C-alpha cells in the first residue's frame, strides 16, 4: 500500500 521515494520529511 506504500510509495517509496522522491519524497521527504
Amino acid at each position, epitope marked *: 500500500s506504500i510509495p*517509496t*521515494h*522522491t*519524497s*521527504p*520529511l
Partner: antibody
Amino acid sequence: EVQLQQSGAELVRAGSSVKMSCKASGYTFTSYGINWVKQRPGQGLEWIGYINPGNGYTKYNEKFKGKTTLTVDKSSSTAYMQLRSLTSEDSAVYFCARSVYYGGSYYFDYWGQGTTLTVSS
Amino acid sequence: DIQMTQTTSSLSASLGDRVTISCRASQDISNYLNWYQQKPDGTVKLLIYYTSRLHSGVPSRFSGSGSGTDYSLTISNLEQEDIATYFCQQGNTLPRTFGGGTKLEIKR
C-alpha cells in the same frame, strides 16, 4: 549532486541566541524536508526537529522545543535553525539532513558538514 | 520515546574481517531502521535504510538486516576507509532516535 552547505562555526555568550544556516542545492528544495541533529562529544546524535519547506510545517522534539525554532527561505533554498536562551549544554555540532520517503517512513540521505557552536564568554 | 541501544561503543576488527554492528530498539520498530556512517573528519553518510537491507550507492559489502527489536549492520570484508562510527536510527515513532554509535578500530 545534492548538497547542503551549513553555516560557519559560531561563538556565543550564554543567555544569548544564534541562527545557523543550511543552503541546499542540486535538487528541489520544497520537495524535501530538512531535519536537524545535534552531536555533543558525549556520543550519540539527537534529533532536534523537522521542517517542510513547502508549507513551513515544523515538528519538534519535545526536549528541544521552546528553545529552538526552525524556519526556511523558499527563495534561496536555505533552512535556518535558531537556538535561544543558550547554555553550556547547547555546545555541540549541529547538522541538517534531507529526508526522503521510502515505503512508509522517512530517512536522511544527505547531511551537511555540520556547524560547530561554542557557548562561552 | 523509543530508546535505541548499541551494545558496544568501540569494536575491534582486522581489515578483511566480517564485522557486525548491533542495535536494539526499546520496542517493535516494524523494520523502520537506518544506518549512518560518520568519519573522523565529522562527515556523515547514509548506507542503509528501511529495516536495513536497502542500499543507496554504497559498496555491496555493506549489508543490513533485523526485525521487530533487533537489527544489525554487517561489513562482510572490512576496508580501511570503512574504519568509522556507525549509528542506527528508528524512523517508526516520533521523536526519531539514534543509538549511541559504534566506533571501529584496528586490532593490534
